[PDB]
Subunit: 252 residues, 4 copies
Amino acid sequence: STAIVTNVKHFGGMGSALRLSEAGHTVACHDESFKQKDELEAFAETYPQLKPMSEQEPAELIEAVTSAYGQVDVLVSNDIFAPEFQPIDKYAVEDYRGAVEALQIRPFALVNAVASQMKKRKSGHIIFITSATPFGPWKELSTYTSARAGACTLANALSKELGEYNIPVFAIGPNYLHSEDSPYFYPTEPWKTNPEHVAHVKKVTALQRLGTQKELGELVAFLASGSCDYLTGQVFWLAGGFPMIERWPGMP
Amino acid sequence: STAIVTNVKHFGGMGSALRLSEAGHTVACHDESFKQKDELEAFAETYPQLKPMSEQEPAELIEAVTSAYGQVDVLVSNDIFAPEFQPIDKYAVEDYRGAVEALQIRPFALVNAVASQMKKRKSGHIIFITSATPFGPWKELSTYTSARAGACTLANALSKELGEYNIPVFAIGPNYLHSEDSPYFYPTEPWKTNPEHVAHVKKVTALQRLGTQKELGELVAFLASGSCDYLTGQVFWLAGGFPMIERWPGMP
Amino acid sequence: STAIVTNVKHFGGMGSALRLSEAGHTVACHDESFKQKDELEAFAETYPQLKPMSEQEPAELIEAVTSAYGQVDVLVSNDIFAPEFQPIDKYAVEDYRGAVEALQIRPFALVNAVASQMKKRKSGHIIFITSATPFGPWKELSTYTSARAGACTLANALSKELGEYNIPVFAIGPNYLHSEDSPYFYPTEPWKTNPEHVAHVKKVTALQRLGTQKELGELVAFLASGSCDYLTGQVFWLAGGFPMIERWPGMP
Amino acid sequence: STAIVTNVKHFGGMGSALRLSEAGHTVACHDESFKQKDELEAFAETYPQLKPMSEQEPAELIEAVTSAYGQVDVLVSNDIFAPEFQPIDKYAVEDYRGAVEALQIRPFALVNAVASQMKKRKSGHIIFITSATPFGPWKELSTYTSARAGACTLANALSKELGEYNIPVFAIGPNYLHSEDSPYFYPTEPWKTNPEHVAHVKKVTALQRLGTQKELGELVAFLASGSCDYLTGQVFWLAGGFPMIERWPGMP
Ligand SMILES: O=[N+]([O-])c1ccc([C@@H]2CO2)cc1
Ligand SMILES: O=[N+]([O-])c1ccc([C@@H]2CO2)cc1
Ligand SMILES: O=[N+]([O-])c1ccc([C@@H]2CO2)cc1
Ligand SMILES: O=[N+]([O-])c1ccc([C@@H]2CO2)cc1
């Protein structure tokens, strides 16, 4: 079918787009850098199987993909934001508004724009790439963490109404997901190359390693395949067993 | 100590303010209507044991209560919003922005404004009145439900950083909480007067009744008393056993 | 690889075994009925793609499969129990002991018997088929529901220690999962053939239908394939959006 | 009213009994040591406000308290077990049976024995002291952690049926709860005396300290008072913000 992957260059974007395309889907890709023709053309050349779009806004993007490929069957809202770790009193209120806009309002706007066509034909899949941070909150990241939780619940809530139209809705919350060249949020440098970082990952995850783009991609393609729609409403914690809890003194 | 209860006329406002006052606290009350001298005066006359403030914005309010009474020891963010039940595609993106501003940004702004003083003296209590909808979402209320989830997690996330400063943070998520004359969200009419509504409540809650303002107030005062700070991070589901799940055919 | 599916004739047994086999795995199958050669041979003839075992106990089963097929790479603990619905005071304490033995001790015993070999190779996958009842408890089924919760947490706890040996552990908790000819727990008759039952499923699930053995099988095969080990520790709610929560009077 | 607190000398026993008594309740106490006359009398002398009982089994205990004090209004099932940390394959299946019998079957048996009298008069409170380990499992404690999870769910499931009879059911899950002279599970020595243990607690809890018996008691008394029955079904995590999750390299 036809799929849309947002912010393709970052977070769970490449894994999702690449595997979806390998599965036979036509994959329209969005990214902030695609505003520049040079960036869009370069992407199209490197990944000829993907279909980069210049459209930036929700309604604009959904309309563009629908016109170019007929309809949108799979929506992968791969949302990102660049937060700072700050004590609550050090954040500016605008810092939270920014987090909520990028992590909650955006996915909401995308579903709001594509839901009608999916409901009319009673078919489609909606996948939010959120975060596992709500499951094990770190101190001093209240904006990003709470916004991600809003997105997770948004997906679960949406599954309740869209199920009547045979539209599954899922949320994939990753952590320690290798992002390769993207800084969102675990790039090769330094996460796979610096001792302290490698050791940190070994300590906090059960599998003692970063998750791979391949793994995220396999999950996305599996859910979008229609092989297991009954998991609708699920929030998947793609965090390799994180968080590992510190044990008592003397214990290995 | 000195407490602040927002939107006192609605939701968990009166139960919280009244019980906190009976516990001996000086309770500064906020409400949109207090912007009008006539409304504020009428409230002060009816409730001489309460201290209504005219201030509307977070910083302005925190500053006024601090100036008049010395400091803010307890913050009860009784947040409200009037959402419409709507299919995802029928909402306007602005409807979600409105829900998040009222249910997430506001409590965040209040803590952002008061956290510094609490941290400097290493004492204080923060309580968010959220919702239990995230625990059992209804179809077609995605904006309100997801926003409330963001608030619940915000409370939990804040508990992690403020604990070092001896500041407990809690979230109380009610449902079917009798709101008396307030339309937010279970007024006496029709929830205690109309047969069908009375029957609905008896079916969906384990205790088969609406929760009382007194019960909410008791919990708020208990948490604010410093009797059980070790519950910091807790999201309390004040919903009387809701949700009750429909059983198989043949089962009463 | 080599997989083991217990209680193959019931619950998620057939879906798991059939899809695992279609995936290319050698699937050893356990069932209480296989104690009778007549039943085992009858099963073997009907399903040449499966390998029914006569062994009933954990240690004996693991040893038998290891001897016959080299080793056990995938363990699918498809646990079942036949509980009665009853008020807490009407149950016999033995009724709870029985539920716990069948739903907690059994999966524990199986992992206890196969873990050492998997750890030595630093490879293997463990899947518990539990229940979604803990997520939305019905009244009067305290034994079954709580035991299933124990099994879910057992899986999550195990993922923490086995991750170090590269062994993912998952729990799939279904509800309204079509069980075809098996009475555990949603057989064709009457769940797909009686109006009241069809209507009940339509009301309590978001997708308004029973889950299929195919869907459960696809998930089991996907997890066992090694395509997404990073989901280790996950409890999957395979309940089609259940539970759907009763809305206010007047709402459709 | 009349309350029963089990294993009073350990875990949440003393805080519960002491505060319930201070609240004016007649508190019948159970403990394995009370099997010996010398132990029961020594306890009665030290704590004259408490009523130690010699009864050990659920039925006889409920009956004895009912005969002596008229009825059982509050049941505080303070369950304990002394597990060993072990890799799954190192445990004996009997070690899990032992954990489940003490942490799941026991509370179930007590409610099974007292539920009828509470239902007949439509009044009563049931509180299980479980554990917060299910919320953040450590590696190698699969027996204890999963059993405690079963108990938490048992309480939640029970709230659904007993609510109709006006009987709230709660579960209090502590961790890092100072147990003073009792080895279950954080005695003064070494948790408040050894530097490494003191440092560990300051690291893994948000409040950076052990919880007190006083705090636990305050919660139990509050819940038993009938001041906030609408919290029925709640699982309280009395863990001071635990778990604190390790942050990235460079962050303090
Ligand atoms: O900003 N951060 O430090 C950050 C850390 C982790 C995440 C994981 C992927 O959700 C996201 C953001
Ligand atoms: O708008 N609504 O229909 C609504 C219903 C229930 C709530 C409960 C209190 O959280 C809030 C809003
Ligand atoms: O006995 N029962 O009524 C029953 C109902 C539901 C289940 C779901 C699959 O876990 C199991 C048993
Ligand atoms: O055995 N243990 O090591 C243990 C550790 C912590 C607990 C906390 C109270 O639940 C219980 C048992």
